[PDB]
Write a protein that binds this DNA or RNA. Structure first.
Ligand SMILES: [Mg+2]
Ligand SMILES: [Mg+2]
Ligand SMILES: [Mg+2]
Ligand SMILES: [Mg+2]
Lengths: 18, 143, 192, 111, 52, 108
RNA sequence: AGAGUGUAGCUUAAAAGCACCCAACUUACACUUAGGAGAUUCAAUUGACGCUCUGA
RNA sequence: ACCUCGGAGCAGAACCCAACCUCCGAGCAGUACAUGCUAAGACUUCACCAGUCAAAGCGAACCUCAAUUGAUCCA
C-alpha cells in the first residue's frame, strides 16, 4: 500500500535502462 | 466388563507421515503463475555445480529427508570426476536405495526444459525408476 | 501520508547509476538461486514463514547423545587425497568414464555411509518423523553405534528395518535378531 | 461540435471483497480484476478472467513473497535476464491458512 | 469469410453439432465426441444453414 | 540406550503373561527422567506398521478383547442459510437442505 | 635493518561456493549441453619459506 | 453534433459517480472441436431481464484478445 512501510517494493523498471 | 476395552470414540494420530500415506493429505495448491508450485508431497531437488552434484528430497514444509551428494567420502572414493554422467547416475542410484530404505517411494520431479532435454537427468530418472520408485505422485482422494 | 520503511529495502543496496557497467543476469538459474536464497533470510515484513505455522524453528534444543570421537581431520584429508590420487592414475577408470559406463558396488558404499555420516541421516530422519518431539519432548540425540535388526519369517529371505521401513504384523510375530558392535565392559538396555 | 463519442462507460465493480481477518469458505471469490495485481499464493486458484478464489476454509492472508517467473513465458524471461546481478521483484501474494482439518478418525462398530 | 456448417456422424445417427469453416476450402472430416456411443467416430459436413 | 554402572530396576518389571493394556502404559519421558545419570541413548531404529489379517488373531488369543474398528470420517460440507426466496438459484437448491430424497407425506 | 602479512583470481567457508578454458548451436555475443586443470609452505596457540611497504 | 459497448484524466491509495469535457477503437480474428455430461461456493455495471470463475465425479490423451452484440411472438 502507499501508506504502509512496504511501499514501492514491487518496482522493477527503475533498475533497467533498455 | 473388560478393563482393556478402553478405546474411546475418538482416536488421534501423532505421526506426520500418515495423512499422505492414505491419500487424504491436502496439497498446498495455488501459485500457478510461478513454477515449482507447492501441489505435491515430496520433491526431487537437484543442484548441479561445476565441482559437485548434489540431489535432495524435500517435503512441502521445507526440510530435506534424504540427500545424495558426491561430497560424501562413501561415493567420492568409488568414482572419478564428480561432473560426468556416471557420477550423477551413481548419485541417483544411491538416493533411490536410501529412499527405499526410508520408506518414501513417491516424489514429484519438475525440472527445467533445458535440463530435462539433457542426458544426465534422463539417465538419473531412469536409474530412479529402475530402482523401485516411480515418479509422478497420484491424485488425492476428495481433493 | 507516507511512512518510513521499517528496515532496509531489498533493492536499495545497489545504485541506479552506471547500470551499463554492472553484470546482468546472463541466465535464469542464477536468478532462481538468488530468489530461493533471499526467501530464506528473515525479513521484517509479512512472509510465508509466519502464518502457516512453523512450530518456532529458531529454538536451540538439547543434545543427549554421545560426543563424536577425536579424529584428526588433516590426516584423514591427506589420506583421502593420496587415495584419490592413486585411483586417478588408473586408465581403466578413465575409459569407463569416457564410455559413459561405470558402475559402483552398493554394499561397499552402504557400509561406508553407515560408518561415516550414517548417524546424521538417521537423526535427521528421526526428527523429521517427530520422534524426539514425542519421546524426549524436544530433546534429541545422535545414534553413534550402528544398529542392525532383521526379522525371521520364511526360510531364505529376511525382513529388515532401517530408518523408516515398512514391516507387516504377520512378518513380525516373533522376536527379531538384533546385532550391534560392542566391547566387553559395557551394558545395554533395549526398549521397543 | 461534439466530436468525441463512446465515453459513456460504467464501473466494473472490481475490487477486494474479503479482507484479512474474514472467515472465507471454499469457493468464495477473493477479488476480480484485470492484469495480475495480487498474484495467487497458497490455496488460491485462478480462472480465465484473472480472478482470485479460495480453495479451503480459513483466514485469508496477504504477504509479499518472491516472484519466480515461468521459463516458458519468454517476456518474463527477458525481463528477468535484463536485470542486474542482485535485483528482486517481491510482489504481493494471497494466501489462505487452513484452520479446520480435512478429516479425523471416529469409531463405528465394535466386533 | 467464414461459414457455419453442421456435421453428421457415421455411427449413431441423431447427434449433430455446428462448427466454423472457411468458405474457399473443401468439406470437413474431424473427430467429435458422440454421447450415444461414448467414443470417437467420424463426422461429415452436410447441409449448411448459415452464411456469416 | 547405554548404561554405565550395572543398575537393576524392579518398579518397571512386567509379569510372564503381560496381556493387559492397562499395565503397558509406558512413557519414555518418565522412564528417562527416573534414570538420567545412568543410561545414555546410543541407538535408534523405527519403521512403519499397517493393518493386516493377523491383528484379529492377536486381539483374539493375545489380549482377550474385541478388535476395535474406525473410519476416516469427514466434516459435513458448508451451506449458507436457506432464505425464503432464493434469487437466481438452480432447481437443485431445495435438495441441498433436504433430509431424505423420498416423497414425504404429512396429514395425508 | 624494521613492520604488515599466510586457502588457486575472491571469502566477518570450515576442503565448499564464486571464477577459467576447450567440443556442439550462433555473422557475432550469449543460454544450455558434453569435459578439464586448480589450493590450508613447514615441525608441535608457537618459530622459520613467499609478497608488499618503510630504508641504505 | 449523437443514438450500443470498452479504455486513458476529471473520479489520484476499497467501490460508485455525470457533461454537447480531450483522445483510441469495436459489429472480429492465426491453429486443435472431450468448445462432453453433472455438481459445493461467489462477483454481478448501483433494481430486474443478462454475463463471468470454480471444488469434485464419470468420461481423454498424459483455448488467446478489451468492446467484439440481439430477448418476447412467429417462421
Ligand atoms: Mg470512463
Ligand atoms: Mg454512466
Ligand atoms: Mg447487483
Ligand atoms: Mg475438474
Amino acid at each position: 500500500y502507499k501508506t504502509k512501510p512496504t511501499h514501492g517494493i514491487g518496482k522493477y523498471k527503475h533498475l533497467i535502462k533498455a | 466388563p473388560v478393563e482393556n476395552e478402553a478405546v474411546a470414540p475418538e482416536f488421534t494420530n501423532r505421526n506426520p507421515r500418515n495423512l499422505e500415506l492414505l491419500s487424504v493429505a491436502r496439497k498446498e495448491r495455488g501459485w500457478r503463475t510461478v513454477f515449482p508450485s507447492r501441489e505435491f508431497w515430496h520433491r526431487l531437488r537437484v543442484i548441479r555445480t561445476q565441482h559437485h552434484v548434489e540431489a535432495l528430497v524435500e517435503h512441502q514444509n521445507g526440510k530435506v529427508v534424504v540427500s545424495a551428494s558426491t561430497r560424501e567420502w562413501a561415493i567420492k572414493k568409488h568414482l572419478y570426476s564428480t561432473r560426468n554422467v556416471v557420477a550423477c547416475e551413481s548419485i541417483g542410484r544411491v538416493l533411490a536405495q536410501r529412499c527405499l530404505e526410508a520408506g518414501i517411494n513417491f516424489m514429484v520431479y519438475q525440472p527445467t526444459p533445458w535440463e530435462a532435454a539433457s542426458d544426465s537427468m534422463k539417465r538419473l530418472q531412469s536409474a530412479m525408476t529402475e530402482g523401485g520408485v516411480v515418479l509422478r505422485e497420484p491424485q488425492r482422494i476428495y481433493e | 501520508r507516507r511512512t518510513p520503511p521499517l528496515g532496509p529495502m531489498p533493492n536499495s543496496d545497489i545504485d541506479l547509476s552506471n547500470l551499463e557497467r554492472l553484470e546482468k543476469y546472463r541466465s535464469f538459474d542464477r536468478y532462481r538461486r538468488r530468489a530461493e536464497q533471499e526467501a530464506q533470510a528473515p525479513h521484517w515484513w509479512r512472509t510465508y514463514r509466519e502464518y502457516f505455522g512453523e512450530k518456532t524453528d529458531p529454538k536451540e534444543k538439547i543434545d543427549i547423545g554421545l560426543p563424536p570421537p577425536k579424529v584428526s581431520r588433516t590426516q584423514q584429508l591427506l589420506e583421502r587425497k593420496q587415495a584419490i590420487q592413486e585411483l586417478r592414475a588408473n586408465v581403466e577408470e578413465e575409459r569407463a568414464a569416457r564410455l559413459r559406463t561405470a558402475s559402483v558396488p552398493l554394499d561397499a558404499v552402504r557400509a561406508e555411509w553407515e560408518r561415516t555420516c550414517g548417524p546424521y541421516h538417521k537423526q535427521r530422519l528421526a526428527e523429521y518423523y517427530g520422534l524426539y518431539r514425542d519421546l524426549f519432548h524436544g530433546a534429541t540425540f545422535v545414534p553413534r553405534v550402528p544398529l542392525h535388526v532383521a526379522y525371521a519369517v520364511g526360510e531364505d529371505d529376511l525382513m529388515p528395518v532401517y530408518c523408516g521401513n515398512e514391516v507387516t504384523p504377520t512378518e513380525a510375530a516373533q522376536a527379531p535378531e538384533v546385532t550391534y558392535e560392542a566391547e566387553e565392559g559395557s551394558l545395554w538396555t533395549l526398549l521397543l | 461540435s461534439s466530436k468525441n463519442l463512446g465515453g459513456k462507460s460504467s464501473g466494473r465493480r472490481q475490487g477486494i471483497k474479503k479482507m484479512e481477518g474474514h472467515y472465507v469458505h471454499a469457493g468464495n471469490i477473493i477479488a476480480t480484476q484485470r492484469h495480475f495485481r495480487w498474484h495467487p499464493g497458497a490455496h488460491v486458484g485462478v480462472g480465465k478472467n484473472k480472478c482470485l478464489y479460495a480453495l479451503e476454509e480459513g483466514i485469508v492472508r496477504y504477504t509479499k513473497e518472491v516472484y519466480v517467473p515461468h521459463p516458458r513465458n519468454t517476456e518474463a524471461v527477458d525481463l528477468i535476464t535484463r536485470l542486474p546481478k542482485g535485483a528482486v521483484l517481491y510482489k504481493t501474494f494471497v494466501h489462505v491458512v487452513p484452520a479446520k482439518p480435512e478429516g479425523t478418525f471416529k469409531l463405528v462398530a465394535m466386533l | 469469410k467464414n461459414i457455419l456448417v453442421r456435421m453428421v456422424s457415421e455411427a449413431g445417427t441423431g447427434f449433430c453439432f455446428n462448427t466454423k469453416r472457411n468458405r474457399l476450402r473443401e468439406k470437413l472430416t474431424l473427430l467429435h465426441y458422440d454421447p450415444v456411443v461414448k467414443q470417437r467416430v467420424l463426422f461429415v459436413e452436410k447441409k449448411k444453414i448459415r452464411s456469416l | 540406550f547405554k548404561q554405565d554402572q550395572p543398575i537393576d530396576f524392579s518398579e518397571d518389571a512386567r509379569p510372564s503373561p503381560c496381556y493387559q493394556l492397562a499395565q503397558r502404559t509406558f512413557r519414555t519421558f518418565d522412564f528417562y527422567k527416573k534414570h538420567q545419570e545412568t543410561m545414555t541413548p546410543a541407538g535408534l531404529s523405527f519403521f512403519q506398521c499397517r493393518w493386516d489379517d493377523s491383528v484379529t488373531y492377536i486381539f483374539h488369543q493375545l489380549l482377550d478383547m474385541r478388535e476395535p474398528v474406525f473410519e476416516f470420517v469427514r466434516p459435513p460440507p458448508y451451506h449458507p442459510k436457506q432464505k425464503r426466496f432464493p434469487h437466481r438459484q438452480p432447481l437443485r437448491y431445495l435438495d441441498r437442505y433436504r433430509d431424505s430424497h423420498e416423497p414425504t407425506y404429512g396429514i395425508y
